[PDB]
Amino acid sequence: ITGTSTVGVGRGVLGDQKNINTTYSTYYYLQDNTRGDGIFTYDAKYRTTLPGSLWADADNQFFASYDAPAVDAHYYAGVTYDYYKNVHNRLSYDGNNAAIRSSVHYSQGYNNAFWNGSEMVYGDGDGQTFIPLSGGIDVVAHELTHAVTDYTAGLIYQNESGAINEAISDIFGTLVEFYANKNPDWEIGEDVYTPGISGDSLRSMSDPAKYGDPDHYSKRYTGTQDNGGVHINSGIINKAAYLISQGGTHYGVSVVGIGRDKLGKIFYRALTQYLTPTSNFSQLRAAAVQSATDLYGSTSQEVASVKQAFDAVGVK
Ligand SMILES: O=C(O)CC(=O)N[C@@H](CS)Cc1ccccc1
Ligand SMILES: [Ca+2]
Ligand SMILES: [Ca+2]
Ligand SMILES: [Ca+2]
Ligand SMILES: [Ca+2]
Ligand SMILES: [Zn+2]
């Protein structure tokens, strides 16, 4: 779309009012020219054919219920682009300002969201298990981070490396939730999961076990479903990351917390410089240790909390 950059206003999935970056050319489109090669949001119109139509609105006001999910996918991808740029000096997912695209209203009552190797896709949920998935900033950033991983370490989506891939996405979506200061926590998908039940979430980083996920390597899932438990075993790494940041005693192993920022800096560095497609949990530990050493010194407290955290979850 070639046209004039402007700013529209809308209401998100959660009923919150926000300004969004649009483009004007007869209609107002969901195309933000202010970030890299642009952020583009599409209408999949309850179908599965992608991407669908670039989103067009006649008056630059996005207050209809059908508008909600596009408003949030659009604004949240903006915030995520900004977090990567500002905090890690990464320009978009490929580091070269690749255009970011998302499709909303994908299929009918689709209870998921995913990065497909080329764009982000969000279901509207069935209204009970989930509300439209783009209404959660941790979900949006989890997605975008899979793009980041794809262009860097390239972690294969199965077994150990796949759980690492899932963990990285969970870690960075929570760091983005904190960055935006959007009621942050160490829970995943809380904003959009089971609209009728308060207080739950899909996964927990603080206590993976609360939902049945392992919090220790000895409790790892060895099976076959979920690509070998990519969404299951990610709980062992999530808990490790939560401890480095926040600290605590887990299974009798004490970890002093080094905080969020440092957590993000060590993870980012591990991801972009030391992890490979086939990296396992033990290699992630070596990666994290080496990053923290690069950054803070071998004898640092930082290096100390990273070894403790992994020893707490039985990795190493
Ligand atoms: O695929 C799954 O089992 C759920 C899942 O984690 N899906 C991911 C896509 S890998 C999207 C998501 C993330 C956070 C919260 C909700 C939805
Ligand atoms: Ca309108
Ligand atoms: Ca939250
Ligand atoms: Ca959260
Ligand atoms: Ca809920
Ligand atoms: Zn994922």
Whichever domain contains 169, its CATH number is: 1.10.390.10
What CA dihedral angle connects 118, 272, 72 and 61, to 10 degrees? Answer: -80
Cα→Cα distances 26→44, 57, 101, 116, Å: 21, 9, 21, 31
Structural domain including 40 reads: 6-154
Catalytic residue among 74, 88, 119, 143: 143
Tokens of 287: 């990666």
Tokens of 184: 């942050």
Dist. CA 29 → ligand 1 center (Å): 28
Ligand nearest to the CA of 141: 1
301-308, long-range: CB < 8 A, 24+ apart: 301/256, 301/258, 302/258, 302/262, 302/266, 304/256, 305/243, 305/244, 305/247, 305/255, 305/256, 305/257, 305/258, 306/244, 306/266, 308/243, 308/253, 308/254, 308/255, 308/256
Is residue 241 assigned to a domain?
yes
Catalytic residue among 74, 88, 105, 231: 231
Query: Is 199 found in the same domain as 144?
Result: no
Ligand nearest to the CA of 64: 2
Query: Is 128 found in the same domain as 44?
Result: yes
Query: Is 201 found in the same domain as 305?
Result: yes
State the structure-solving technique.
Answer: X-ray
User: What is the Cα 76 distance to its own chain's centre?
Assistant: 11
User: What is the Cα 195 distance to its own chain's centre?
Assistant: 20
Query: Is 148 found in the same domain as 179?
Result: no
Query: Is 209 found in the same domain as 181?
Result: yes
Amino acid making up residue 256: V
Q: Single out the residue in 122, 138, 154 at which a domain terminates.
A: 154
The CATH number assigned to the domain holding 148 equals 3.10.170.10
Contact between 121 and 103 under an 8 Å Cβ cutoff? The reply is yes
Question: What is the C-alpha separation between 315 and 16, in angstroms, rounded?
Answer: 42
Question: What is the C-alpha separation between 262 and 281, in angstroms, rounded?
Answer: 20
Strands 247-250 and 31-32: unpaired
Which residue's C-alpha comes closest to atom 4 of ligand 1? Answer: 112
Q: HSE (CB half, 13 Å, CA atoms) of 157?
A: 13
Contact between 108 and 125 under an 8 Å Cβ cutoff? The reply is no
Residues near ion ligand 6 (Cβ under 5 Å): 169
Query: Is 209 found in the same domain as 275?
Result: yes
Is residue 248 assigned to a domain?
yes
Dist. CA 276 → ligand 5 center (Å): 36
Query: Is 160 found in the same domain as 16?
Result: no
Is residue 1 assigned to a domain?
no
- Pocket test of ligand 1: the residue of 102, 112, 169, 225 to mutate, having most ligand atoms within 8 Å of its CB, is 112
Contact between 208 and 238 under an 8 Å Cβ cutoff? The reply is yes
Query: Domain count of the chain?
Result: 2
Question: What is the C-alpha separation between 112 and 125, in angstroms, rounded?
Answer: 7
Query: Is 245 found in the same domain as 128?
Result: no
Is residue 215 assigned to a domain?
yes
Cα→Cα distances 239→102, 157, 183, 280, Å: 30, 20, 20, 16
Contact between 57 and 67 under an 8 Å Cβ cutoff? The reply is yes
Q: Single out the residue in 97, 126, 154 at which a domain terminates.
A: 154
Query: Is 161 found in the same domain as 110?
Result: no
215's CB contacts (< 8 A; 6+ apart) are 207, 208, 209, 235, 236, 239, 250, 313
User: What is the Cα 258 distance to its own chain's centre?
Assistant: 22
Cα→Cα distances 16→8, 72, 228, Å: 14, 10, 38
Dist. CA 166 → ligand 1 center (Å): 9
The total of other beta-carbon atoms located within 10 Å of residue 306's CB is 28
- What Å resolution does this PDB entry report? 1.7
Question: What is the C-alpha separation between 255 and 303, in angstroms, rounded?
Answer: 11
* Residue 250 annotated in active site: no
Identify the DSSP state of 183: S
Contact between 179 and 134 under an 8 Å Cβ cutoff? The reply is no
Question: What is the C-alpha separation between 76 and 96, in angstroms, rounded?
Answer: 20
Which residue's C-alpha comes closest to atom 9 of ligand 1? Answer: 114
Query: Is 211 found in the same domain as 171?
Result: yes
* Residue 216 annotated in active site: no
Is 177 among the annotated ligand-binding positions?
A: yes
Total number of residues shown for the chain: 316
Query: Cis link prior to 51 (omega < 30° from 0)?
Result: yes
Residue ranges lining ligand 1, Cβ < 6 Å: 112-114, 133, 139, 142, 188-189, 202, 231
Is residue 73 assigned to a domain?
yes
The total of other beta-carbon atoms located within 10 Å of residue 55's CB is 25
Query: Is 40 found in the same domain as 71?
Result: yes
Among 114, 246, 112, 115, smallest CA distance to 178 is for 246
Question: Ligand 1, closest atom to CA 146?
Answer: 10
Is residue 238 assigned to a domain?
yes
Q: Single out the residue in 105, 127, 154 at which a domain terminates.
A: 154
Question: What is the C-alpha separation between 190 and 199, in angstroms, rounded?
Answer: 8
β-strand partners of 21: 7
Query: Is 102 found in the same domain as 222?
Result: no
Amino acid making up residue 60: N
Dist. CA 261 → ligand 4 center (Å): 17
What CA dihedral angle connects 253, 256, 257 and 261, to 10 degrees? Answer: -120
Question: What is the C-alpha separation between 80 and 39, in angstroms, rounded?
Answer: 11
